[PDB]
Amino acid sequence: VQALVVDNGSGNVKAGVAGDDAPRSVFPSIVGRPKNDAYVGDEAQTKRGILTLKYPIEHGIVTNWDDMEKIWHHTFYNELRAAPEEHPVLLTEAPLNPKGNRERMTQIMFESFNVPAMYVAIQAVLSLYSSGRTTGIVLDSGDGVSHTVPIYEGYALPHAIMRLDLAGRDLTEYLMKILHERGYGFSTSAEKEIVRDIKEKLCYIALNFDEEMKTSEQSSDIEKSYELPDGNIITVGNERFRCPEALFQPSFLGKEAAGIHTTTFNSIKKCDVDIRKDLYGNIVLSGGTTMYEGIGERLTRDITTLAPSTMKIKVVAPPERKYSVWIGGSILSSLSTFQQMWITKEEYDES
Amino acid sequence: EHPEFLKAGKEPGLQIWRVEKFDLVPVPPNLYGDFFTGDAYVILKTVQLQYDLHYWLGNECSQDESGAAAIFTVQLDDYLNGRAVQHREVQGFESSTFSGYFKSGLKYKKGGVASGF
Numbered sequence: 138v139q140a141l142v143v144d145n146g147s148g149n150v151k152a153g154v155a156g157d158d159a160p161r162s163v164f165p166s167i168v169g170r171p172k173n174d175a176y177v178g179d180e181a182q183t184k185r186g187i188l189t190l191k192y193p194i195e196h197g198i199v200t201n202w203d204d205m206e207k208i209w210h211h212t213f214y215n216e217l218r219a220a221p222e223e224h225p226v227l228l229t230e231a232p233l234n235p236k237g238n239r240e241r242m243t244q245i246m247f248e249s250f251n252v253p254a255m256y257v258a259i260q261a262v263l264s265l266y267s268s269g270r271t272t273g274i275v276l277d278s279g280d281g282v283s284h285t286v287p288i289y290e291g292y293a294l295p296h297a298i299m300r301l302d303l304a305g306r307d308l309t310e311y312l313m314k315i316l317h318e319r320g321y322g323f324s325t326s327a328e329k330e331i332v333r334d335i336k337e338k339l340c341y342i343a344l345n346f347d348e349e350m351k352t353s354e355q356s357s358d359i360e361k362s363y364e365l366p367d368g369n370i371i372t373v374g375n376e377r378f379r380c381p382e383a384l385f386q387p388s389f390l391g392k393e394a395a396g397i398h399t400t401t402f403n404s405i406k407k408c409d410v411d412i413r414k415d416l417y418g419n420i421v422l423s424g425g426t427t428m429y430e431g432i433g434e435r436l437t438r439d440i441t442t443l444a445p446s447t448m449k450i451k452v453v454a455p456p457e458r459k460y461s462v463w464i465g466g467s468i469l470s471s472l473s474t475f476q477q478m479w480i481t482k483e484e485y486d487e488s
Numbered sequence: 489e490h491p492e493f494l495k496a497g498k499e500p501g502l503q504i505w506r507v508e509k510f511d512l513v514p515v516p517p518n519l520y521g522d523f524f525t526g527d528a529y530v531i532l533k534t535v536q537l538q539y540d541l542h543y544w545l546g547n548e549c550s551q552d553e554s555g556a557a558a559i560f561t562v563q564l565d566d567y568l569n570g571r572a573v574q575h576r577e578v579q580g581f582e583s584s585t586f587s588g589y590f591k592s593g594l595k596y597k598k599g600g601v602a603s604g605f
């Protein structure tokens with residue numbers, strides 16, 4: 138039998154079949170219920186008029202189990218058309234997910250969906266494996282959460298995992314905010330999806346923020362255009378790099394949190410000195426919010442500045458890192474050894 | 489229960505497997521030291537017992553192969569009670585220890601087994 142691979146993303150579910158090189162189903166992690174049954178994903182956005190919309194896994198931790206079960210039913214029946222009770226399932230979880238949350242997801246899978254066998258994988262560990270490594274630190278920046286996850290010889294080091302206190306959604310919201318300088322008033326949920334696309338299409342990370350502010354003011358070379366759904370054109374200038382700069386300077390968002398460079402550094406420092414060289418030499422980016430042009434070179438400069446000068450800093454930016462969690466799950470669940478890693482329903486039910 | 493795990497690390501010597509369609513497949517001993525640039529491999533060196541696991545990544549191997557090599561390395565180490573030291577070996581930048589396992593030195597060949605993806 139062929140396993141199903143479900144990456145439970147804070148912003149979008151990625152799902153598909155073991156052995157594929159990418160997820161066949163990607164849809165928003167949203168559940169819509171009548172304002173005065175439930176709709177999931179794109180269907181729920183299309184009906185935002187007549188629905189109240191909710192994110193059940195806003196920051197990578199499931200907070201509404203009824204809605205999460207609707208998302209999983211949508212995954213199996215409307216997206217994959219797969220009987221969950223006839224396939225092994227690999228499910229992903231956030232770094233530092235509480236055991237009680239893992240146990241509740243496991244209960245739902247075994248008792249509501251009757252899945253015959255299941256394995257739960259840490260998202261960042263799967264990304265590391267998808268990069269062809271057993272040791273490294275993964276910087277996974279998604280929609281509602283980011284984490285830095287040191288991994289040694291296959292296993293995350295729980296005492297060193299850090300949360301970076303912003304993610305892609307925060308960046309979309311910040312671009313929405315700073316576009317008010319130019320007179321734009323994007324504010325509705327639907328306009329927010331537009332601004333998300335603007336961010337993905339036009340933004341980039343400056344190698345040196347202060348120098349880019351200086352060079353961008355000296356001409357209009359920075360300005361780039363985008364066609365709105367109504368055919369109007371918007372032009373964006375220094376917002377293109379000021380928006381993702383908040384990953385490095387969360388004070389731009391009014392947060393006291395450390396930026397992703399500082400967080401990665403602190404995360405590595407939690408690991409014993411004898412393994413840090415291998416972490417610094419294997420800093421692996423994953424997730425959609427690591428997709429900005431310029432991120433690897435900027436992160437290399439900044440972590441090199443912070444780290445002892447004897448360390449060799451290597452930031453790895455795989456081209457298909459937006460889906461590397463899901464890909465790592467597809468590989469693991471395809472291995473000839475996967476059948477020895479999972480828990481069966483019979484074992485669970487008799488445990 | 490995987491048959492090759494059951495054979496791993498029982499005697500001093502050198503064991504080489506190639507990732508082939510999501511499985512670990514012994515390399516014919518007559519090919520030891522020649523590595524297809526299109527493939528990924530797992531190598532266990534046992535010394536009288538000390539264990540060193542190396543996973544070797546060809547410049548043209550596919551993502552399923554390099555990922556499986558990494559994961560099989562972890563699984564073999566666990567099967568050996570965590571006692572193996574793991575080493576990532578990239579074509580053309582291999583450790584002197586890994587190169588030292590092959591009297592004739594390391595060599596590379598074009599091609600490889602097809603991707604499982």
Ligand SMILES: Nc1ncnc2c1ncn2[C@@H]1O[C@H](COP(=O)(O)OP(=O)(O)O)[C@@H](O)[C@H]1O
Pocket residue numbers: 145146147148149150278279280281282304305306333336337338423424425426427428429459
């Ligand atoms: N090319 C891109 N550039 C910048 N951000 C991107 C790009 N592609 C996607 N994103 C952002 O990545 C986030 C989704 O990333 P993902 O890793 O799928 O998150 P999650 O797993 O938390 O659902 C969104 O905020 C999205 O806007």
Ligand SMILES: [Ca+2]
Pocket residue numbers: 526527528548549550553599600601602603
């Ligand atoms: Ca190959």
Ligand SMILES: [Ca+2]
Pocket residue numbers: 290565570571572573574
């Ligand atoms: Ca070990």
Ligand SMILES: [K+]
Pocket residue numbers: 441442443444445446
């Ligand atoms: K330094």
Ligand SMILES: [Mg+2]
Pocket residue numbers: 145146147260279280424462
């Ligand atoms: Mg994610």
